């Protein structure tokens, strides 16, 4: 459940099949967006995890795994930024902002795209009989 190794796979395929130069930048922007999303999620979720841990209903080793992930994510982000600097000279002061925008933008995009499937679950669970034109025929 990650978008990390896919970028390396695309890089290895580029190393032999002579793909264009923009696909690498695309995959890199995607990896950056995913990293920022995970960073924000963990930052805003830390206090509730800590409360549940102090309450004594989550265990012990999960807290250590979480604390390790906190800094592993930052290390991954730093590696991505270094790769971005390597790919294009003097191209870091724009990368963070472009990533901070694409994160929220594609988040909204997915949230909106989910409705085409979400629409029929209610149909099935409430046993409606809907004809065409979105009207109700009971």
């Amino acid at each position: 459940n990650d978008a990390h190794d896919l970028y390396f796979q695309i890089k290895e395929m580029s190393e032999n099949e002579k793909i264009h130069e923009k696909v690498l930048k695309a995959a890199l922007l995607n990896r950056g967006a995913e990293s920022v999303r995970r960073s924000l999620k963990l930052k805003e979720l830390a206090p509730q995890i800590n409360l549940l841990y102090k309450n004594g209903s989550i265990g012990e080793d999960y807290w250590k795994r979480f604390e390790t992930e906190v800094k592993l994510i930052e290390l991954e982000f730093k590696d991505t930024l270094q790769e971005a600097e390597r790919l294009q000279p003097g191209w870091v002061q724009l990368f963070v902002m472009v990533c901070k925008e694409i994160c929220f933008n594609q988040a909204l995009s997915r949230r909106y795209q989910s409705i085409l499937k979400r629409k029929e679950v209610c149909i099935k669970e409430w046993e409606l009989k809907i004809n065409n034109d979105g009207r109700l025929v009971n």
């Binding site: 509730q48 995890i49 549940l52 209903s57 999960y62 997915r110 409430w126």
Partner: protein, 485 residues
């Protein structure tokens, strides 16, 4: 000093006799010194299937022997015939000097080296692995890892919660060969009231164990301040304990003997208990399609005994820690609506004493327990419950752990006041047998768990009290705090 053991067996009988007397006597003295009507305790065991019965069936002499030993030892004593100090011990001679000498020391080596550390380590591992709630740690880790990366886009249904439950670790120790897919399929065949074919003794086990797992999931979801998952958890618990799929008109399919192929096809407007009771006695049988009086009485007696709630008065209370108070009226699905104005207002008020002000929950702790539920397909026997959870109305998040109340007086349901019916419609409030002082009104106290905000204004709340065993009618109200200072 240096002792010399007893070699003629002259003293150890008295020692053993007094050692036995001191332990026996007080035990004999101790042995010498040594609310809610339930109408389902009979009809539950009558409709449960036979395989479930066989499953649920499948999965002081010390005093007398001590007295006989006392007798034989006393006889052995009475049969016997018998300056510097000479020390002597009471234990016999053969225990330390004969050929059984290394036996004692090797038994001691064993009991000290191989029994104590092994047992202590095993017990410590067992008690350390388990989480405080009562579930394994791998299961809690999986629940949290699944709730973390959970897209808000996917709507929570029953199948999703079943898919989550199929990954529990406690299901693996029971059957180290099976896979989570088999567990999902078993639970699906249970919910759809289908036969597993060969794995019935596994389906019953996992269904019996599902309870604590769902409790843990509910608690964790309430911890993450997420309401949809907790509500879905309560609904899935209902569906599993009652063995019925979640549909619009389910409260009328949970009844003992109804045929779906008749009800769904014929009627389409009867949706819950009240609309059903609106009809007469013969029309009920004609609609349900059972046409059997001896069995119609049973299904009506079950359909007139599942508890519906109703609010009377709800407001804040401000001690050092705020705690909410509720006044509910546990009623059956048959009594018509009684107005709140007829309440004598005596029951609703609380006595103000020092002991009551110290711990107000003491009065709640006095109410009786609830009867055994009506679970024709849940393997074990379950007691009714009521899980109450509170959230905010400005954003829509759970703000505390859910409180699980268990004690409630179901007195208003008994077969004594059967005259008070809805189909009579002649204003039975002005009846000779109507006594407003007989109907008892339970009480529920919910601590707010969070301090009041330091601002001044109105802040709305929302408390829900859902059932956990039936498909009855529950509460969903909005109350606001008027912080004024």
């Amino acid at each position: 000093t240096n002792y010399e053991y007893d070699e003629a067996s002259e003293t150890w009988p008295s020692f053993i006799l007094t050692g036995l007397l001191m332990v026996v006597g007080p035990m004999t003295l101790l042995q010498i010194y040594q609310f809610n009507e339930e109408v389902f305790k009979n009809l539950n065991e009558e409709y449960t299937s036979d395989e479930i019965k066989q499953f649920r069936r499948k999965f002081n002499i010390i005093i007398i022997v001590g007295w006989i030993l006392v007798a034989i030892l006393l006889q052995r004593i009475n049969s016997n015939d018998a300056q510097s100090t000479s020390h002597g011990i009471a234990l016999p001679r053969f225990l330390v000097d004969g050929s059984a000498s290394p036996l004692l020391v090797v038994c001691y080596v064993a009991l000290l080296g191989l029994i104590l550390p092994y047992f202590v380590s095993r017990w410590w591992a067992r008690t350390q692995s388990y989480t405080k709630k009562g579930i394994h740690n791998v299961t809690a880790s999986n629940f949290v890892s699944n709730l973390v990366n959970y897209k808000p886009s996917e709507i929570v249904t029953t199948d999703l919660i079943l898919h989550w439950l199929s990954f529990a670790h406690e299901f693996k120790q029971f059957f180290p060969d099976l896979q989570p897919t088999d567990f999902e399929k078993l639970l699906q065949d249970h919910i759809n009231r289908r036969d597993s074919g060969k794995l019935n003794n596994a389906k019953f086990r996992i269904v019996a164990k599902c309870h604590s797992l769902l409790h843990g999931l509910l608690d964790i979801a309430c911890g993450f301040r997420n309401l949809d998952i907790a509500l879905g958890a309560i609904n899935t618990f209902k569906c599993i304990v009652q063995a019925v799929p979640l549909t619009p008109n389910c409260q009328i399919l949970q009844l003992p003997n109804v045929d779906k192929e008749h009800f769904i096809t014929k009627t389409g407007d009867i949706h819950t208990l009240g609309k059903l009771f609106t009809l007469e006695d013969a029309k009920i049988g004609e609609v349900l399609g059972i046409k059997d009086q001896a069995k119609l009485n049973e299904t009506l007696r079950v359909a007139s005994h599942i508890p519906n709630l109703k609010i009377i008065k709800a407001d804040f209370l401000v001690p050092g820690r705020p705690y909410i108070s509720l006044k509910v009226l546990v009623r059956s699905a048959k009594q018509p609506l009684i107005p709140t104005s007829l309440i004598p207002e005596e029951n609703l008020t609380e006595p103000q004493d020092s002991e009551s002000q110290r711990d107000p929950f003491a009065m709640m702790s006095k109410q009786p327990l609830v009867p055994y539920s009506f679970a024709p397909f849940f393997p074990t026997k379950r007691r009714g419950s009521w899980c109450c959870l509170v959230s905010s109305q400005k954003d829509g998040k759970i703000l505390q752990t859910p409180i699980i109340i268990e004690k409630l007086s179901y007195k208003n349901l008994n077969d004594d006041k059967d005259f008070f019916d809805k189909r009579i419609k002649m204003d039975l409030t002005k009846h000779e047998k109507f006594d407003i002082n007989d109907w008892e009104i339970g009480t529920i106290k919910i601590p707010l768990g969070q301090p009041a905000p330091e601002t001044v204004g109105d802040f709305f709340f929302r408390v829900i009290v859902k059932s956990t065993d039936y498909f009855t009618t529950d509460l969903d109200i909005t109350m606001n705090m008027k912080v004024r200072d």
